[PDB]
Amino acid sequence: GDERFYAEHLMPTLQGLLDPESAHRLAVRFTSLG
């Protein structure tokens, strides 16, 4: 794991699993799902 662990497990993780647009978009959907 290098290019798929440092770019596929770091970018979408550090800048996607808690991003104001990536994490908020995937969260708001579950928060306002009903």
From Swiss-Prot:
Cellular localisation: Mitochondrion inner membrane
UniProt superkingdom: Eukaryota
PTM remark: The uncleaved transit peptide is required for mitochondrial targeting and proper membrane integration.
Note: The identification of DHODH defects as the cause of postaxial acrofacial dysostosis (POADS) was obtained via exome sequencing, demonstrating that this method is a powerful tool for identifying genes underlying rare Mendelian disorders. Exome sequencing consists of targeted resequencing of all protein-coding subsequences, which requires around 5% as much sequencing as a whole human genome.
Clinical note on disease: Postaxial acrofacial dysostosis: An autosomal recessive syndrome characterized by severe micrognathia, cleft lip and/or palate, hypoplasia or aplasia of the posterior elements of the limbs, coloboma of the eyelids and supernumerary nipples.
Membership in a protein family: Belongs to the dihydroorotate dehydrogenase family. Type 2 subfamily.
Function: Catalyzes the conversion of dihydroorotate to orotate with quinone as electron acceptor. Required for UMP biosynthesis via de novo pathway.
Summary of subunit composition and partner proteins: Monomer.
Protein name in UniProt: Dihydroorotate dehydrogenase (quinone), mitochondrial
